[PDB]
Symmetry: D2
Subunit: 317 residues, 4 copies
């Protein structure tokens, strides 16, 4: 007895008495992720080096095409696209999908873990689809998750029911359910942030970090880890517990991370796992977007760790 993503999605669509439109969608995503995973591990590179005689771009095209061919979407928002993609009326479904095809594109050359981030909305309204359909607060997410191309490829899927992790057996091209109903640690022992911006941190952030390296109660300090790819850092947080942070600074007073296809998908996964995701002031999932490429600060992770910072945030208010 083994559960595959294909089996799982189908049983879940069945319990929910769906028309089967969203199952077609989740199955198209699984296929797109397997195709990207293969391109990322460099299968076929020899041909490129003349054996017989871009990666973000290939990833964008794969997701966009595999999604359109699902006949389940009406609007697609990608980090690589200035405007939202409105689906041809022939292949139009009722879902709006926001995604980042290959996050951590800067790390590609250094071979660091990279990933794909997606969020699915049910179109709410009754008129010609447009960007406006994508502009829904994260709280309205039907499903969200990510695929991490690291030492192994894993798909983490979060829906109203919970968070489940699927490992890719590359030998048979099938995702195996390896961890179900995942809940994050109440309090972790690792903090993640680019301290190279110390000079730009607000006093609350500055204070938290200080408390982590030099514990006022003389407890053990927190270990530091900052991979440089959100999916890798967040995935480690989900699994090992701790806190990830990318607050505003000179690097945009609005933070660097995008709201629709990065912050929201990850906040949704986080909340479903039993942790928190805040901007320091408000819950990420409650922000009403104004633009499809709107950035937003984010702090996420174990509840006890995110609350501790939230307090320091209040103190300096």
């Amino acid at each position: 007895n083994i559960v595959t993503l294909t089996r799982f999605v189908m049983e879940q669509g069945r319990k929910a008495r769906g028309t089967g439109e969203m199952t077609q969608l989740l199955n198209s995503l699984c296929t797109a992720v397997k195709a990207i995973s293969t391109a990322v591990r460099k299968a076929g590179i020899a041909h490129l080096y003349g054996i017989a005689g871009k990666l973000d771009v290939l990833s964008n095209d794969l997701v966009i095409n595999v999604l359109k061919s699902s006949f389940a979407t009406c609007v697609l928002v990608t980090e690589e696209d200035k405007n939202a993609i409105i689906v041809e009326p022939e292949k139009r479904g009722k879902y709006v999908v926001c995604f980042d095809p290959l996050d951590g594109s800067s790390n590609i050359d250094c071979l660091v873990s990279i990933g794909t981030i997606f969020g699915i909305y049910r179109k709410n309204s009754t008129d010609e689809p447009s960007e406006k359909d994508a502009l829904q607060p994260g709280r309205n997410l039907v499903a969200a998750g990510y695929a991490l191309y690291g030492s192994a490829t894993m798909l983490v899927l979060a829906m109203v029911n919970g968070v489940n992790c699927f490992m890719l057996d590359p030998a048979i091209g099938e995702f195996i359910l390896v961890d179900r109903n995942v809940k994050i640690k109440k309090k972790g022992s690792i903090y993640s942030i680019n301290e190279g911006y110390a000079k730009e941190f607000d006093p609350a952030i500055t204070e938290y970090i200080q408390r982590k390296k030099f514990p006022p109660d003389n407890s053990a300090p927190y270990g530091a880890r900052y991979v440089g790819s959100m999916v890798a850092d967040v995935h480690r947080t989900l699994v090992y517990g701790g806190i990830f942070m990318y607050p505003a600074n000179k690097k945009s007073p609005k933070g660097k991370l995008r709201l629709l296809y990065e912050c929201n998908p990850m906040a949704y996964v986080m909340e479903k796992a039993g942790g928190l995701a805040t901007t320091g002031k408000e819950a990420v999932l409650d922000i009403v977007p104004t633009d499809i490429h709107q950035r937003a600060p984010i702090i996420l992770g174990s509840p006890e760790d995110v609350t501790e910072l939230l307090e320091i945030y209040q103190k300096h208010a």
Copy 2:
């Protein structure tokens, strides 16, 4: 045209006029790395999950076995073994290999990049091979390098004539020379260290770090990155420039990283790439070891960055 590791290695052994003993060794190694990469990527995991009909220990066995059968080694030192392994008189060769089968094994469950590290010495004290044979300064390395199981698998090989990077094409199980004679930037813009140990850093490290976040002449501060996997952090240093540091601290008064199978191979690769690798007080490669599992502090990366920290070390002494 297309250059494969196999062709490159043979061609080099020919120019060198070797008896083909080292070529067999390097060919065995390459085979062991493709086997580990496959296990690491979780090929066949569906069988553990009951479709019907560890990873560090498995890696150790692969390396040990594939190397013994090469008939080119007499002494083996693994991070996984307390004692040095002495090869059977029947399979003995003239080479001594020091290796870390799967480095970054804490990052396994979090799916972060991990790797294999190897250093190769030639037994010169023709006596019954013993532990003593491995106790040579890194300055005596014949060959050294590593395999990084990241977003893609890469094998970095360093020898007297240079450093060359080989990318694995998993479709045909062949390593392709993607980069020839690799040389690191003189000065980088990323520092890598576990700042969670800030409370235990010597004044030289402490000063250098603060100088990176708050530059005297108001220049751009360095970005921070610390994956937590030496092979991954060092590969980023090699490819993009910067400095990696794992200094001595209370928990590790002599550092954490081992001399023979971690510090030395990375120091050797760094030097051949045109960079520096220091203890803070002396060059890693000149240290004559006393214990096979001896630890050593290490700082490596671009020459201009490593020098700057070396000056601060001189200033506080």
Copy 3:
């Protein structure tokens, strides 16, 4: 735009307003076939040869387990099993599946193309499931098909709507629809039969062969091909046209091929493609089975070729 087996099955289940029980079934079969294909191409053989220190049986277990875990079947009949497998009431569905996990097992050692054969029945009755549910004339098949592990792996699926061929892209573990609504040639130019039994053929068969090598109308003779694996011979017939024959002789007066899991699945595929499948006397699909391992003679292929023999059969009646 590309159609995958997963997409295809889902859209077909949707058009048919099914509960989704048969889709779960066809999806479990696709997974089983990918797992068998991988075992057949010998991935992981190195471990068997001690790199770090039955095939029909593995195939039986894979199909049986993957099928039971679909929760869509009540009775399974396998060539490798003396008795029919009655599903645990926990995982009991309404379908009866007859299959040959790995046909051409004798050819394994010689590396000749081998395959899997399956036929799906809807249980008809309302009582405790038993072998008796498998004993339905082939005419009652819901779906049937085969997977051929040859130079490439292909799944041919036949349902009331028609016959469609899916090629396995082993890189992404997905079956791609490469040929839809396949129809066989009216008259082919190849005959397939083990002529080593010439001494045992009845006069009609003897006469047909003679007419093929020495055309009475002085037309070009037919080419001969007999791989030795039914799936390969039949698949070539479907694609290139011609006739395949395995009539009775000293090798059982009932022929060698089994009725439920070999003859029927292939006759069903054949008829749906627009060809014929006969025992010489009657249509294979109309035989009422008496035993689950009942053998039956079979002649199949292009209509004009099968009719020509049928006439010679009548002449000697």
Copy 4:
């Protein structure tokens, strides 16, 4: 322990004391075979089918390119090329290679086993390399063998010291020695020939065939098998015993199969395996060719079977 083609080849070159030139050649060949196997198995086909972003010609290019780059060849003869290819003075070596990149190309669309055939001669007439250099009797072969892309990929290598079979483990892209010093059964029980040419067979062939179906002393008749792919039929002959025949007929008065890249390599493998390979009148290996694309009749297989047919040939003359 585990023996890989790479290790085996190097070890043999060492014992032979070669300059490593032939080893490079055999290593290049092995690389070309893994590349063809992958293309043959349809890895990446989903890209032709619009997931968004020949086979014989491709095989030809792979072989030609991978061989030229080995710097070990001066003349190449392909079934795909009218003229013999003369390697650039810059990449020239001392070896001449005669090959059939993808044999059985008619069986491609039917997914039947196909393969690559190669014969290697040493240029002895040290003159500007020309077509003349390839025109050597097979008796002068340095090495010969084939790659069979069947249910699994296998590489059969024959040299002065014997025939060895290597199975490809596609997971790690390594060929494993599965069978050492292969020797064919003295007498088999399967005959292989296209009986659709019965109307054009000489009396010797005609008599031998009828003697196989109707044995004088009532013994068991031989089974018939004719895949239609030489590499596949000959591999079965090699592994299981028997006889393969492609005699001269009206359509092919001198036979169909080519001498240099089909008959010779298979004749060489047969002789080293302890079998016979005849034209009916003379040994295939002793024929001194006049044309690079010269055809020749061929009969090979177990010694006892081939002799029996040779006697019948003597009787009718």
